[PDB]
Structure formats: structure tokens, C-alpha cells
Design an enzyme around this catalytic site. Structure first.
Site, mmCIF file in Angstrom:
data_model
loop_
_atom_site.group_PDB
_atom_site.id
_atom_site.type_symbol
_atom_site.label_atom_id
_atom_site.label_comp_id
_atom_site.label_asym_id
_atom_site.label_seq_id
_atom_site.Cartn_x
_atom_site.Cartn_y
_atom_site.Cartn_z
ATOM 1 N N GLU A 55 0.831 -1.187 0.000
ATOM 2 C CA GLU A 55 0.000 0.000 0.000
ATOM 3 C C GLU A 55 0.880 1.257 0.000
ATOM 4 O OE1 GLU A 55 -3.154 0.549 3.172
ATOM 5 O OE2 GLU A 55 -1.493 1.716 4.004
ATOM 6 N N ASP A 230 -5.791 -4.515 -3.390
ATOM 7 C CA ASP A 230 -6.060 -3.090 -3.490
ATOM 8 C C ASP A 230 -4.811 -2.236 -3.777
ATOM 9 O OD1 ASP A 230 -5.097 -3.551 -0.843
ATOM 10 O OD2 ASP A 230 -6.028 -1.670 -0.188
ATOM 11 N N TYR A 275 -10.495 -21.659 -2.758
ATOM 12 C CA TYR A 275 -10.172 -23.005 -3.222
ATOM 13 C C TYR A 275 -10.877 -23.316 -4.532
ATOM 14 C CZ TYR A 275 -8.007 -23.580 1.345
ATOM 15 O OH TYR A 275 -7.193 -23.422 2.443
ATOM 16 N N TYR A 299 -7.299 -11.165 -0.956
ATOM 17 C CA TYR A 299 -5.940 -11.580 -1.288
ATOM 18 C C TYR A 299 -5.908 -12.783 -2.214
ATOM 19 C CZ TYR A 299 -7.315 -15.122 2.089
ATOM 20 O OH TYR A 299 -8.066 -16.103 2.710
HETATM 21 O O1 LIG Z 1 -6.643 -1.378 7.476
HETATM 22 C C1 LIG Z 1 -7.134 -0.114 7.066
HETATM 23 C C2 LIG Z 1 -6.043 0.938 7.104
HETATM 24 O O2 LIG Z 1 -5.934 1.394 8.461
HETATM 25 C C3 LIG Z 1 -5.054 2.516 8.588
HETATM 26 O O3 LIG Z 1 -5.032 2.896 9.911
HETATM 27 C C4 LIG Z 1 -6.231 3.501 10.394
HETATM 28 C C5 LIG Z 1 -6.941 2.545 11.348
HETATM 29 O O4 LIG Z 1 -7.344 1.377 10.652
HETATM 30 C C6 LIG Z 1 -8.164 3.227 11.944
HETATM 31 O O5 LIG Z 1 -8.752 2.383 12.923
HETATM 32 C C7 LIG Z 1 -7.766 4.564 12.576
HETATM 33 S S1 LIG Z 1 -9.197 5.454 13.280
HETATM 34 C C8 LIG Z 1 -8.764 5.400 15.051
HETATM 35 C C9 LIG Z 1 -8.165 6.742 15.508
HETATM 36 O O6 LIG Z 1 -6.904 6.948 14.885
HETATM 37 C C10 LIG Z 1 -7.984 6.777 17.008
HETATM 38 O O7 LIG Z 1 -7.557 8.075 17.394
HETATM 39 C C11 LIG Z 1 -9.314 6.434 17.679
HETATM 40 S S2 LIG Z 1 -8.888 6.574 19.459
HETATM 41 C C12 LIG Z 1 -10.570 6.799 20.170
HETATM 42 C C13 LIG Z 1 -11.108 8.071 20.368
HETATM 43 C C14 LIG Z 1 -12.358 8.231 20.933
HETATM 44 C C15 LIG Z 1 -13.079 7.100 21.304
HETATM 45 I I1 LIG Z 1 -14.964 7.298 22.196
HETATM 46 C C16 LIG Z 1 -12.564 5.831 21.110
HETATM 47 C C17 LIG Z 1 -11.320 5.688 20.548
HETATM 48 O O8 LIG Z 1 -9.717 5.116 17.296
HETATM 49 C C18 LIG Z 1 -10.004 5.021 15.892
HETATM 50 C C19 LIG Z 1 -10.457 3.595 15.642
HETATM 51 O O9 LIG Z 1 -11.525 3.234 16.505
HETATM 52 O O10 LIG Z 1 -7.092 5.391 11.616
HETATM 53 C C20 LIG Z 1 -5.891 4.794 11.116
HETATM 54 C C21 LIG Z 1 -5.235 5.818 10.215
HETATM 55 O O11 LIG Z 1 -6.162 6.329 9.273
HETATM 56 C C22 LIG Z 1 -3.647 2.136 8.164
HETATM 57 O O12 LIG Z 1 -2.828 3.290 8.232
HETATM 58 C C23 LIG Z 1 -3.656 1.577 6.740
HETATM 59 O O13 LIG Z 1 -2.362 1.093 6.416
HETATM 60 C C24 LIG Z 1 -4.683 0.441 6.624
HETATM 61 O O14 LIG Z 1 -4.782 0.016 5.277
HETATM 62 O O1 LIG Z 2 2.573 -28.967 3.869
HETATM 63 C C1 LIG Z 2 2.409 -29.895 2.806
HETATM 64 C C2 LIG Z 2 1.164 -29.599 1.988
HETATM 65 O O2 LIG Z 2 1.194 -28.198 1.647
HETATM 66 C C3 LIG Z 2 0.040 -27.814 0.899
HETATM 67 O O3 LIG Z 2 0.028 -26.443 0.785
HETATM 68 C C4 LIG Z 2 -0.497 -25.762 1.926
HETATM 69 C C5 LIG Z 2 0.655 -25.262 2.773
HETATM 70 O O4 LIG Z 2 1.413 -26.359 3.251
HETATM 71 C C6 LIG Z 2 0.103 -24.489 3.945
HETATM 72 O O5 LIG Z 2 1.177 -23.962 4.709
HETATM 73 C C7 LIG Z 2 -0.803 -23.353 3.454
HETATM 74 S S1 LIG Z 2 -1.519 -22.465 4.868
HETATM 75 C C8 LIG Z 2 -2.201 -20.925 4.081
HETATM 76 C C9 LIG Z 2 -3.678 -20.709 4.451
HETATM 77 O O6 LIG Z 2 -4.456 -21.787 3.946
HETATM 78 C C10 LIG Z 2 -4.233 -19.384 3.907
HETATM 79 O O7 LIG Z 2 -5.440 -19.085 4.599
HETATM 80 C C11 LIG Z 2 -3.255 -18.196 4.066
HETATM 81 S S2 LIG Z 2 -3.253 -16.427 3.418
HETATM 82 C C12 LIG Z 2 -4.110 -15.684 4.818
HETATM 83 C C13 LIG Z 2 -4.488 -14.339 4.825
HETATM 84 C C14 LIG Z 2 -5.186 -13.829 5.882
HETATM 85 C C15 LIG Z 2 -5.501 -14.679 6.925
HETATM 86 I I1 LIG Z 2 -6.576 -14.025 8.471
HETATM 87 C C16 LIG Z 2 -5.133 -15.995 6.939
HETATM 88 C C17 LIG Z 2 -4.447 -16.488 5.903
HETATM 89 O O8 LIG Z 2 -1.913 -18.561 3.727
HETATM 90 C C18 LIG Z 2 -1.446 -19.656 4.511
HETATM 91 C C19 LIG Z 2 0.067 -19.685 4.383
HETATM 92 O O9 LIG Z 2 0.638 -18.467 4.844
HETATM 93 O O10 LIG Z 2 -1.855 -23.872 2.626
HETATM 94 C C20 LIG Z 2 -1.378 -24.596 1.480
HETATM 95 C C21 LIG Z 2 -2.611 -25.058 0.738
HETATM 96 O O11 LIG Z 2 -3.788 -24.706 1.453
HETATM 97 C C22 LIG Z 2 0.080 -28.462 -0.478
HETATM 98 O O12 LIG Z 2 -1.044 -28.035 -1.242
HETATM 99 C C23 LIG Z 2 0.058 -29.983 -0.304
HETATM 100 O O13 LIG Z 2 0.296 -30.607 -1.560
HETATM 101 C C24 LIG Z 2 1.113 -30.465 0.716
HETATM 102 O O14 LIG Z 2 0.817 -31.801 1.097
#
Ligand SMILES: OC[C@H]1O[C@@H](O[C@H]2[C@H](O)[C@@H](O)[C@H](S[C@H]3[C@H](O)[C@@H](O)[C@H](Sc4ccc(I)cc4)O[C@@H]3CO)O[C@@H]2CO)[C@H](O)[C@@H](O)[C@@H]1O
Ligand SMILES: OC[C@H]1O[C@@H](O[C@H]2[C@H](O)[C@@H](O)[C@H](S[C@H]3[C@H](O)[C@@H](O)[C@H](Sc4ccc(I)cc4)O[C@@H]3CO)O[C@@H]2CO)[C@H](O)[C@@H](O)[C@@H]1O
Ligand SMILES: [Ca+2]
Length: 629
Positions: A55, A230, A275, A299
Site C-alpha cells: 500500500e 487493493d 479453493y 488476497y
Molecule cells: O486497514 C485499514 C487501514 O488502516 C489505517 O489505519 C487507520 C486505522 O485502521 C483506523 O482504525 C484509525 S481510526 C482510530 C483513531 O486513529 C484513534 O484516534 C481512535 S482513538 C478513540 C477516540 C475516541 C473514542 I470514544 C474511542 C477511541 O480510534 C479510531 C479507531 O476506533 O485510523 C488509522 C489511520 O487512518 C492504516 O494506516 C492503513 O495502512 C490500513 O490500510
Molecule cells: O505442507 C504440505 C502440503 O502443503 C500444501 O500447501 C499448503 C501449505 O502447506 C500451507 O502452509 C498453506 S496455509 C495458508 C492458508 O491456507 C491461507 O489461509 C493463508 S493467506 C491468509 C491471509 C489472511 C488470513 I486471516 C489468513 C491467511 O496462507 C497460509 C500460508 O501463509 O496452505 C497450502 C494449501 O492450502 C500443499 O497443497 C500440499 O500438496 C502439501 O501436502
């Protein structure tokens, strides 16, 4: 030659540009990589100030493109693309073609369920659960002659603060790392940072692998990267304007355009279900494009073996409206200069364009704001959609996609970032679908902006929702969604969102003539310039209401699992956020932060987020260009 621009606002951009690039200010690392923020004590998306994101790089490209437009110098935009390809796009060493070429399109990956609580992890792999076919791989390997993917990994430990280093050496910088892995309830605070290249040299007996997915035998050494759709779309968007402005001045960024186009080609992996299950019928395995929702999901990720050859690739079933980019889709599907090499690249993006604008309209509430999104995998396990739940092409409506702590669509930010792309589209094409979305959304936000006598101001910050949109009928269209409402929880002075807001209103006004949008966009820019400028750009004091999690947030570690972070911190059940990141105690702002907590006060900070600064500059550039007088 380029059209004349409003000198006042052009000057303001040039000023900000000098501040952002000024080595004394510290926005970049010694390798030319931008930081998430100057201050290191930072937790919100990344959990450390000097770890960057894709980003950030995309905002870096946008800034430099705007600079080319005013100085005639595009070498900085070209360097912005060099740093990306060098440090954020995994190289040949980081994603071994020997492993990527063993990839099988009929069995892209092994299914593993998703859980609503971090303590349910590691998730068990189940080879009996169906997985669909990958239709675009052969398009890509054949057009580029490689099996490696060309997209950006989302988060990078720029100065090797965590210690993992490059490909397990522990000493190199930048270091490829990842955080989020365990579901909707895993916040920035509940993760266990881990290396992308896992050779088992750090962490547990098997690195960090068995913390997340459980297999039948011994985990293998492996690498995995996760894309942030994004940001890649935003990179394409920014590269397009750079191309436009360069040509207007007899200069070219031909080479950067090629990179951006290839990136958009690979970006299509986000169009598919995690998947590859059929869209609207999750229990059936996909046969190809019937598993494509054509939206920019949360993603797409890939990985492979390090000491054995195999690989996998996954899309995402979860879709948030804030990730969509109708402009990038218009670019890649209609502009000959950005026509992807793959056979279906351009037309797939044409389909995404129509689908994206339907998604936006489907989620527009009674007031005008845009609702969360939809998923093709209920509860992340392809479960049954509760009766009564509205749907978009079979996908169920979700109020806060992917994250619940805090909800992904409770931050006003998603509103401006996404709609700014819809404004750029309407400005360039006058598209009717975009006009309708913007006329209503713009009217909502304009009644929510507050200007104070002393020059300060407020805009929505945290929002909430009620109801759900009506089930989408493509022939019927927008019903009006009378039972879907947005509530503004509280206001604030987010300079980044204010800037992104100014940007959106400027493009819209420039096309529709809405004077209200114009004067507000300019009042915002003026307000920020006059009352929030400082030596490093712009800022304001803000409360960090979640920082108590620094000390009170427990991190889940499975029973019996024990490991170490590179610096020696022990990882076991019972540790807290701070316990596996003990270096945070050397931060210049640490004592100040803790003293406030001890005395029972919410800490405060004066932050300089790289993207907010660039957003303010770019915003000034846009205004100077569209309103020359
Ligand atoms: O993932 C999305 C992007 O997020 C960016 O960071 C933002 C945060 O996600 C967002 O929550 C906050 S808004 C946050 C205020 O900064 C904070 O001051 C308040 S504190 C408060 C005050 C009064 C009361 I009643 C309760 C709490 O809390 C707010 C959240 O609840 O803003 C930041 C920056 O914009 C990342 O920078 C970006 O990389 C991500 O993509
Ligand atoms: O290990 C042998 C087998 O591997 C298989 O491939 C798998 C990998 O081993 C395993 O580590 C990954 S785990 C993967 C999660 O499924 C996925 O959700 C996430 S990205 C993400 C983003 C946000 C959030 I919240 C949570 C997750 O990425 C993870 C890794 O970082 O999975 C693959 C396949 O599912 C082979 O396919 C197989 O042949 C082997 O036997
Ligand atoms: Ca939680």
C-alpha cells in the site's frame, strides 16, 4: 504540452514533495524504501512503524507520478518501480521456479477450514475436501515463460527489526515477513509475526508453520507470500496517470508501464474463490471461470517447498467494497498501452469492471454510504448461508468482511479510498453507473463535514451499520436499500482520510459541476494547509485508544508449543503482545506511552503516516490540475 495548473495548490504539492523526500525527515530507509510512518511506536495494520506495506509503495508511485507532471522529471517514478520489483515482488531466489513449476492447475491447493477464534488454530488440512481448477495459470506461464507470480507481497520488515533476515540468514534487510493467519478474531495485536521463507531456523521445532496449519506428517521447509489486491490495483492506477502526464510532455515511462501491465495480469488471481469453488454454489468444485467472482478479493497467495519441489496458489472468497478499483479495470481493459499479454487478461478485466460497479451499487445504503461486501465461504468453511441473508450472485452479505476486531468496514477510510476510484472513472468516462453512485454518496458525506470557526474540522471516523441490502437482481437493479443504514459513531480529524476525501470531491465536482463538492474539497485542503502543517508535512495529536493491548493482550500459543523469536524472546502460552516483541522497550516513545497507561490516560501521538502525507500532496496536485483558476 501540459495544461496550465493552479499555481497556489501546485506550490503546496511541491512543498510537501520536498518534505516527504527530505532525508532529514526520515520517511525512507537507506535503501529508498518508504516506512509506514516516521514514528516507530506504531500499531494499526502493521504492528511496527518501520515495516512497510505494498500500500505504501503504491502511494510512493502516485506521489512521484504527480511530481513528474509538475517538473517534467519522471526518473523518480521509475525508481519507485525499481525499488518495488527489487524488494516487494519476490525474486527468483525468494520464489524458486523449481518449485513453482511443479504447480498443478487441477489441484491448486489443499483445503483447510477457517475459524472464528484464534484458539482453534492450527487448522487441519483435509485432502478429501474438493478444490476447483485454475483457468489462468496456463495463460500466464505461456505469456511470460515463467511459473513465478508477479504481484507484491503486502508487508515487509524494512530494517530487519524482527531479526528473521533474508531467507533465514537473520542479518539481511529488508526481511519478508507476514502477520495475520488466524481468522476474523485475530487483530494486529493477536498475531505471531513469522518469516515468509521458513527454514525452521527460528521459532519452534518447525519454525512457525504448525502454529497455523496442521498436516498429517512433519511440516516441510517452505515459503509463502500474500498479496494485497487493493495496492496492486492502485499501482496500476498511478502508473496510468504517469503515462498520461509523460506523453503530454514528450517523455515516456514505457518501461514502468510494462511492469504495471504484467502486475495487473497476475492480479486476476484475486478474482477467484479461495479453493476455486463455484460462485454461488460453494460445495461443488469449480470447472474454471465459474469459480470467478470477478471482484478484487482480500488476497491471493502462493507458496512452495524449499528443500523439495511443489507449490500452491489460492484466491479469496471474501470481498470488501473498499478494495475494488473500477478505474484500474477500465485502464487494463480499454487502454492499448496497458493491454495485458495473456490471452484473456483484458476481457477478464472488462468483466470485472461491470461486476465491480454492480457490487458498489448493491451495497449502497439508504443514506448513501457503501456497505461491507460479500463472501462465497460462509464462516470460512463453505457453510450454509443462514436463511434471510441477502446475496450477490449467490454470495452472502457480510457486514464486516474478514475482520471483526475491529470490523473491517467500521473505518470511514474505506469510504473515500474506494469511491475516489469511482470518481476518477466518472471524470474520464462520464459513466452513468458511476454518476448514480457518486451523486448519492457525495450528498451523504457533504452533510457530514464540520468546519469550526478556529479553522479546525471534523469528518466521520468510526461508523456502524444496521440491516442488509436487498438481494441483488441484475435486471431490477438498485432497489434503494431502505432497510440498510449507516450510523456515524464518532468524528475526528484524520488528515489522510480528509485528504482522500478532498481528492474524491474534486474529481466529482470537476465533472458534475457540484459547487458544494468543490468548495468543501478546497476548504479541506486549505484547512489542513493553514492549521496542520509542520516541519515534516502535516499532523495533529490523536488518541491511541488501543495501546493498552500493548500490555494486556494475550497471544494464543497452542498447548505444548514453545519457541523463540530471533532476539531470544520465548513463545509459549501466556505471553502478551509485548512479550514476543521485547525490543519495543527501547523505543524513544515507550516510557511516555507506559506512563500514560499507568496513570490511566489514553496515550496520544502526533503521527506521520507516509500514505497520509502522500495523500495530502496528491490531493493538492489534483486540485491544481482540475481547477486552474
Ligand atoms: O486497514 C485499514 C487501514 O488502516 C489505517 O489505519 C487507520 C486505522 O485502521 C483506523 O482504525 C484509525 S481510526 C482510530 C483513531 O486513529 C484513534 O484516534 C481512535 S482513538 C478513540 C477516540 C475516541 C473514542 I470514544 C474511542 C477511541 O480510534 C479510531 C479507531 O476506533 O485510523 C488509522 C489511520 O487512518 C492504516 O494506516 C492503513 O495502512 C490500513 O490500510
Ligand atoms: O505442507 C504440505 C502440503 O502443503 C500444501 O500447501 C499448503 C501449505 O502447506 C500451507 O502452509 C498453506 S496455509 C495458508 C492458508 O491456507 C491461507 O489461509 C493463508 S493467506 C491468509 C491471509 C489472511 C488470513 I486471516 C489468513 C491467511 O496462507 C497460509 C500460508 O501463509 O496452505 C497450502 C494449501 O492450502 C500443499 O497443497 C500440499 O500438496 C502439501 O501436502
Ligand atoms: Ca480478538
Amino acid at each position: 504540452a501540459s495544461s496550465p495548473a493552479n499555481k497556489v495548490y501546485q506550490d503546496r504539492f511541491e512543498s510537501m514533495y520536498s518534505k516527504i523526500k527530505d532525508p532529514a525527515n526520515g520517511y525512507f530507509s537507506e535503501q529508498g524504501i518508504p516506512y509506514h510512518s516516521i514514528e516507530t511506536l506504531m500499531v494499526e495494520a502493521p504492528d511496527y512503524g518501520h515495516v512497510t506495506t505494498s500500500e505504501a509503495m503504491s502511494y510512493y508511485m502516485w506521489l512521484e507520478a504527480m511530481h513528474g507532471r509538475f517538473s517534467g522529471d519522471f526518473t523518480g517514478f521509475d525508481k519507485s518501480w525499481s525499488v518495488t520489483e527489487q524488494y516487494l515482488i519476490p525474486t527468483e531466489k525468494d520464489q524458486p521456479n523449481t518449485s513453482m513449476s511443479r504447480y498443478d492447475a487441477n489441484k491448486p491447493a489443499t483445503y483447510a477450514p477457517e475459524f472464528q477464534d484464534p484458539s482453534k488454530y492450527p487448522s487441519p488440512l483435509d485432502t478429501s475436501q474438493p478444490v476447483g481448477r485454475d483457468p489462468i495459470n496456463s495463460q500466464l506461464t505461456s505469456a511470460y515463460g515463467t511459473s513465478m507470480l508477479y504481484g507484491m507481497h503486502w508487508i515487509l520488515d524494512v530494517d530487519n527489526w524482527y531479526g528473521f533476515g533474508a531467507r533465514a540468514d537473520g542479518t539481511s534487510k529488508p526481511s519478508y515477513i507476514n502477520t495475520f493467519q488466524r481468522g476474523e478474531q485475530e487483530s494486529t495485536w493477536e498475531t505471531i509475526p513469522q518469516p515468509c521463507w521458513d527454514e525452521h531456523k527460528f521459532g519452534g521445532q518447525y519454525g512457525f508453520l504448525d502454529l497455523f496449519t496442521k498436516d498429517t506428517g512433519t511440516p516441510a521447509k517452505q515459503f509463502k507470500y500474500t498479496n494485497a489486491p487493493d495496492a496492486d490495483a492502485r499501482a496500476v492506477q498511478a502508473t496510468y496517470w504517469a503515462d498520461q502526464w509523460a506523453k503530454e510532455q514528450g517523455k515516456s515511462v514505457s518501461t514502468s508501464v510494462g511492469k504495471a501491465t504484467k502486475m495487473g495480469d497476475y492480479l486476476r488471481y484475486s478474482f477467484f474463490d479461495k479453493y476455486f469453488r463455484k460462485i454461488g454454489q460453494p460445495s461443488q468444485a469449480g470447472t474454471g471461470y465459474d469459480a470467478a467472482h470477478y471482484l478484487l478479493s482480500w488476497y491471493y497467495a502462493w507458496g512452495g517447498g524449499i528443500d523439495s519441489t511443489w507449490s500452491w496458489i489460492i484466491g479469496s472468497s471474501h470481498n470488501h467494497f473498499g478494495y475494488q478499483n473500477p478505474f484500474a479495470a477500465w485502464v487494463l481493459s480499454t487502454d492499448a498501452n496497458f493491454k495485458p499479454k495473456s490471452s484473456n487478461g483484458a476481457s477478464d478485466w472488462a468483466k470485472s469492471l461491470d461486476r465491480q460497479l454492480e457490487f458498489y451499487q448493491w451495497l449502497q445504503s439508504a443514506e448513501g454510504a457503501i456497505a461491507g461486501g460479500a463472501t462465497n465461504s460462509w464462516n470460512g468453511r463453505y457453510e450454509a448461508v443462514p436463511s434471510g441473508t441477502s446475496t450477490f450472485y449467490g454470495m452472502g452479505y457480510v457486514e464486516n468482511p474478514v475482520y471483526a476486531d475491529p470490523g473491517s468496514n467500521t473505518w470511514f477510510g474505506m469510504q473515500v479510498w474506494s469511491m475516489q476510484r469511482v470518481a476518477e472513472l466518472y471524470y474520464k468516462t462520464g459513466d452513468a453507473r458511476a454518476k448514480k453512485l457518486l451523486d448519492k454518496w457525495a450528498k451523504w458525506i457533504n452533510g457530514e463535514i464540520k468546519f469550526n470557526a478556529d479553522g479546525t474540522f471534523q469528518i466521520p471516523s468510526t461508523i456502524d451499520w444496521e440491516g442488509q441490502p436487498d438481494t441483488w437482481n441484475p435486471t431490477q437493479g438498485y432497489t434503494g436499500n431502505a432497510n440498510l443504514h449507516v450510523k456515524v459513531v464518532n468524528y475526528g480529524t484524520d488528515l489522510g482520510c480528509a485528504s482522500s476525501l478532498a481528492n474524491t470531491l474534486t474529481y466529482y465536482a470537476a465533472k458534475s459541476g457540484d459547487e458544494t463538492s468543490r468548495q468543501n474539497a478546497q476548504k479541506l485542503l486549505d484547512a489542513m494547509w493553514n492549521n496542520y502543517s509542520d516541519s515534516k508535512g502535516i499532523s495533529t495529536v490523536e488518541q491511541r485508544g488501543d495501546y493498552h493491548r500493548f500490555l494486556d493482550q494475550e497471544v494464543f500459543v497452542p498447548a505444548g508449543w514453545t519457541g523463540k523469536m530471533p532476539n531470544g524472546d520465548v513463545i509459549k502460552s501466556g505471553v502478551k503482545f509485548i512479550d514476543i516483541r521485547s525490543k519495543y522497550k527501547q523505543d524513544p516513545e515507550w516510557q511516555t506511552m507506559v506512563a500514560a497507561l499507568q496513570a490511566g490516560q489514553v496515550p496520544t501521538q502526533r503521527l506521520h503516516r507516509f500514505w497520509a502525507q502522500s495523500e495530502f500532496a496528491v490531493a493538492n496536485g489534483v486540485y491544481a490540475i482540475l481547477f486552474p483558476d
